[PDB]
Amino acid sequence: GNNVVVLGTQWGDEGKGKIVDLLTERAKYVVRYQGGHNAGHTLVINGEKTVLHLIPSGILRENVTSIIGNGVVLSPAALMKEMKELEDRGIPVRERLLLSEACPLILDYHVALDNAREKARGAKAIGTTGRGIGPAYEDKVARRGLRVGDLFDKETFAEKLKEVMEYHNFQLVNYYKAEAVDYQKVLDDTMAVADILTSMVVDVSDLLDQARQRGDFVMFEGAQGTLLDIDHGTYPYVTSSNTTAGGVATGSGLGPRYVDYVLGILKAYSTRVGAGPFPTELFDETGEFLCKQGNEFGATTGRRRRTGWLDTVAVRRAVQLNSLSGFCLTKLDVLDGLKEVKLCVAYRMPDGREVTTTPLAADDWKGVEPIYETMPGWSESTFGVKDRSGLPQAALNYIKRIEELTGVPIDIISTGPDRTETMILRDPFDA
Amino acid sequence: GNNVVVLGTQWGDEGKGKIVDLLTERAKYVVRYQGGHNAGHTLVINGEKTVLHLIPSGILRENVTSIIGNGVVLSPAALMKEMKELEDRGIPVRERLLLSEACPLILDYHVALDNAREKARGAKAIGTTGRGIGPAYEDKVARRGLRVGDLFDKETFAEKLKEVMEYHNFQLVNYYKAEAVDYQKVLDDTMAVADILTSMVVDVSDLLDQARQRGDFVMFEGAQGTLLDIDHGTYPYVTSSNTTAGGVATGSGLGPRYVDYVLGILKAYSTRVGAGPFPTELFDETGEFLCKQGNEFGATTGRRRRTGWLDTVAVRRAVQLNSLSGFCLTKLDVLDGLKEVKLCVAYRMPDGREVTTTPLAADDWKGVEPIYETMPGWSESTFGVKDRSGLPQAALNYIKRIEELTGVPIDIISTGPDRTETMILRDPFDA
Ligand SMILES: O=c1[nH]cnc2c1ncn2[C@@H]1O[C@H](COP(=O)(O)O)[C@@H](O)[C@H]1O
Numbered sequence: 001g002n003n004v005v006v007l008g009t010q011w012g013d014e015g016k017g018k019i020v021d022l023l024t025e026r027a028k029y030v031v032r033y034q035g036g037h038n039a040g041h042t043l044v045i046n047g048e049k050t051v052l053h054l055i056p057s058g059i060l061r062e063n064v065t066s067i068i069g070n071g072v073v074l075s076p077a078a079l080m081k082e083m084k085e086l087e088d089r090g091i092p093v094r095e096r097l098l099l100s101e102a103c104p105l106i107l108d109y110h111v112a113l114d115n116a117r118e119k120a121r122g123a124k125a126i127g128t129t130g131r132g133i134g135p136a137y138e139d140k141v142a143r144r145g146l147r148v149g150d151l152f153d154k155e156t157f158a159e160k161l162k163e164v165m166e167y168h169n170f171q172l173v174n175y176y177k178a179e180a181v182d183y184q185k186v187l188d189d190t191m192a193v194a195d196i197l198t199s200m201v202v203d204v205s206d207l208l209d210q211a212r213q214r215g216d217f218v219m220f221e222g223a224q225g226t227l228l229d230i231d232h233g234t235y236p237y238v239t240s241s242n243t244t245a246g247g248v249a250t251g252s253g254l255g256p257r258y259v260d261y262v263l264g265i266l267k268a269y270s271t272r273v274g275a276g277p278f279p280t281e282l283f284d285e286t287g288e289f290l291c292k293q294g295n296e297f298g299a300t301t302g303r304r305r306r307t308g309w310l311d312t313v314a315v316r317r318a319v320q321l322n323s324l325s326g327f328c329l330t331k332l333d334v335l336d337g338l339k340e341v342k343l344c345v346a347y348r349m350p351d352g353r354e355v356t357t358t359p360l361a362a363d364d365w366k367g368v369e370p371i372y373e374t375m376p377g378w379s380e381s382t383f384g385v386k387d388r389s390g391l392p393q394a395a396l397n398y399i400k401r402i403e404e405l406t407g408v409p410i411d412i413i414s415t416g417p418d419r420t421e422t423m424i425l426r427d428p429f430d431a
Numbered sequence: 432g433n434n435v436v437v438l439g440t441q442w443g444d445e446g447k448g449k450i451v452d453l454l455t456e457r458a459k460y461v462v463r464y465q466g467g468h469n470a471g472h473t474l475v476i477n478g479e480k481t482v483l484h485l486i487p488s489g490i491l492r493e494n495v496t497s498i499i500g501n502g503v504v505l506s507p508a509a510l511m512k513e514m515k516e517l518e519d520r521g522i523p524v525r526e527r528l529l530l531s532e533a534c535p536l537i538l539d540y541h542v543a544l545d546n547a548r549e550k551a552r553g554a555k556a557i558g559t560t561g562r563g564i565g566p567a568y569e570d571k572v573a574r575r576g577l578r579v580g581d582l583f584d585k586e587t588f589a590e591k592l593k594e595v596m597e598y599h600n601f602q603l604v605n606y607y608k609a610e611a612v613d614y615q616k617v618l619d620d621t622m623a624v625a626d627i628l629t630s631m632v633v634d635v636s637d638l639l640d641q642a643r644q645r646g647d648f649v650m651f652e653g654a655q656g657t658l659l660d661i662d663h664g665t666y667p668y669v670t671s672s673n674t675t676a677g678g679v680a681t682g683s684g685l686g687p688r689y690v691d692y693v694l695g696i697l698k699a700y701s702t703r704v705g706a707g708p709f710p711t712e713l714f715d716e717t718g719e720f721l722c723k724q725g726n727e728f729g730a731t732t733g734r735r736r737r738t739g740w741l742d743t744v745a746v747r748r749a750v751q752l753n754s755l756s757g758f759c760l761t762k763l764d765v766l767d768g769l770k771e772v773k774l775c776v777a778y779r780m781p782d783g784r785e786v787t788t789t790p791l792a793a794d795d796w797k798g799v800e801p802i803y804e805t806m807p808g809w810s811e812s813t814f815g816v817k818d819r820s821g822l823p824q825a826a827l828n829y830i831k832r833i834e835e836l837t838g839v840p841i842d843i844i845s846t847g848p849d850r851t852e853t854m855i856l857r858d859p860f861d862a
């Protein structure tokens with residue numbers, strides 16, 4: 001497929017970053033279709049780490065033009081901060097990076113509000129990244145949200161910002177009894193970056209249309225995972241954006257029909273950060289062990305991630321929703337040393353029902369229970385193997401099973417953070 | 432195609448309703464993927480009108496199961512009102528209609544807010560349908576919006592409604608200096624309908640997955656048109672929902688890859704209701720004439736629609752965005768009697784540039800001008816013709832041209848509101 005997609009099945013942290021990079025060695029474009037600066041896609045080339053939040057994981061490549069579609073929330077401060085850091089490391093960001101005229105803007109109050117709201121909820125605290133994502137998406141749909149294109153006329157801009165800010169401030173000081181977020185500073189801060197920003201602007205809709213008719217390999221890169229989807233996730237303990245493969249055409253501008261392959265990244269175990277239902281969770285040794293064995297802390301907020309076994313019931317929702325074509329199995333090595341690995345084949349509802357289908361909203365997960373299928377483990381190390389035959393039959397079997405339990409082929413295995421600690425049995429871009 | 436889509440190219444009012452019905456004579460399902468009660472899809476079977484707002488245009492058919500996906504805003508009052516009216520006319524709605532566990536709810540305050548906000552803007556009044564759509568979509572992404580599934584536990588429901596309402600009321604009385612919208616009545620009104628509602632609930636994601644593997648003809652039905660798209664439209668003078676063909680997979684639950692044909696409805700002239708940029712607008716005889724000749728008043732609010740010639744520059748944005756496969760040409764008969772019909776082939780930017788590509792945001796349309804291509808008209812009547820050879824060469828040519836100017840084939844022509852006043856040269860469901 002010319003148009004290959006790569007997104008996350010679980011609750012994010014599957015390892016999209018490494019995968020986009022590693023895969024883009026033929027990519028003309030690379031697009032972020034949704035999200036804000038809440039992701040933390042990590043790359044490790046020949047031994048050197050890189051932690052990309054808002055900047056597409058195709059940035060570390062000359063040939064690839066990295067873009068950020070209309071479906072993205074953009075924090076000016078955020079962008080520039082990532083820019084500097086990437087620049088000082090030799091990456092010509094300003095040259096490679098492209099960006100949407102339509103991307104709504106994330107200013108400081110969007111953080112202010114996010115901050116305030118998460119407080120009011122007290123106990124029922126979702127677990128937001130503190131990056132103002134929600135409020136920007138909000139204002140966006142409200143039709144008061146400022147977008148990149150508004151910067152194309154500093155005159156009227158500060159006029160709108162004046163109103164928008166006043167409004168958001170009335171509730172900051174009167175409702176939440178908080179502190180007014182100062183307009184002027186917002187403006188000063190925003191004006192000292194406009195020209196740099198507005199310089200990379202483009203009509204990404206027509207771009208994709210063009211590339212397509214030429215036949216340019218294009219790869220979309222998703223932030224977060226399906227179960228966190230605004231519409232189809234464990235609401236409301238989810239993200240404010242359609243992290244599903246339908247976000248592509250809505251977030252980029254490209255027509256739905258031109259998607260040629262959706263690659264679902266699948267972490268060999270489960271992890272969740274932020275509050276919400278996590279059926280297969282663990283609080284025993286294996287729980288902490290998985291947290292340790294795979295360095296499980298939120299690559300943006302540092303929050304220690306929760307562990308559990310690969311929930312196959314959950315995966316299957318993803319499989320249908322995102323129309324997978326194959327699976328990218330990441331983190332196998334974390335399972336090394338276990339005496340036994342077990343996955344979840346079905347749910348036992350709180351009323352006695354056994355089922356292989358999932359509950360929607362958060363409430364509906366209230367008493368669900370994991371029904372496993374324990375398989376042997378392995379003391380052998382699968383770390384860095386790049387050939388199937390370097391995987392012991394046990395682990396080999398764990399793969400065979402997951403293909404069956406899903407009907408989706410695991411076209412890629414990954415034995416490490418480093419781009420070369422990967423095994424490719426089926427390349428998205430050519431089949 | 433098994434999975435055929437049908438949505439609007441212009442600014443809505445293309446004639447989706449008539450088309451879904453007429454086309455669904457083989458449809459198992461029919462899905463609304465987005466919108467609220469702001470649409471007014473009209474049907475005329477054998478001479479009898481039907482004006483469907485929130486209820487899928489497949490309702491008037493026994494075999495077809497009409498559904499409303501997670502991407503829809505649902506006003507309880509609204510649904511029940513349309514239900515009664517359809518029932519008294521003999522349509523077994525409760526039996527045919529299906530609906531999402533995930534659809535966020537539109538209560539009265541959502542109207543209250545919408546009302547209030549449109550006021551504050553004074554002059555820069557968008558032109559909302561007054562159906563609280565925006566605020567529900569808002570709260571939705573805010574992650575405080577109540578959804579159909581919340582009704583599955585009246586206990587906790589009124590607890591949430593209590594908070595949600597208080598919050599929305601603080602700003603109603605303190606900010607906008609309006610009147611508090613009473614909680615209790617909201618509850619009473621909402622509880623007197625829950626069981627009826629919650630009875631049609633379903634897992635529409637898995638439904639579509641199933642249908643697909645069986646091979647069930649499915650037709651999605653769009654509300655509004657592309658140029659009003661929250662993301663890709665003339666922002667902010669647009670609607671708060673992704674009226675683009677990417678809304679399907681986000682609004683229904685079906686995977687993007689399984690779309691087999693996007694049918695773009697194309698009205699033979701242009702119309703716009705609500706404020707915003709309308710390049711090809713008319714204020715002369717032809718302007719009022721088109722308003723008269725095609726009964727141009729908003730089928731929900733009664734608002735007289737604005738007229739103009741078919742803007743081919745605009746259409747082409749739609750063509751690329753929604754990945755059209757063909758065109759449904761509606762309202763040809765309105766052009767009867769004209770001495771000459773002219774369409775718009777390109778834009779003359781306010782700086783001198785000639786271009787066949789469109790501006791995004793509303794501001795960016797500030798001085799754009801229509802560059803026509805006048806073709807002869809026709810005194811012959813094309814009203815009700817059902818054969819191509821009943822169309823005079825002039826009108827025939829107008830079709831040939833639009834296929835060229837777009838590269839998209841006009842697979843369907845429509846000579847009247849009535850289902851049988853149609854000509855089909857290519858059926859979506861079988862090619
Ligand atoms: O990339 C991510 N990794 C892990 N958790 C995330 C990520 N993006 C969002 N979240 C979760 O999604 C939820 C909503 O936060 P938000 O995206 O800041 O609005 C929180 O629970 C965060 O845990």
Ligand SMILES: O=c1[nH]cnc2c1ncn2[C@@H]1O[C@H](COP(=O)(O)O)[C@@H](O)[C@H]1O
Binds near residue numbers: 562671706
């Ligand atoms: O189906 C429709 N026909 C015509 N105008 C519509 C339709 N749906 C929404 N609008 C326009 O979209 C804009 C936003 O209104 P809203 O959808 O009520 O939030 C207004 O200008 C309405 O004109």
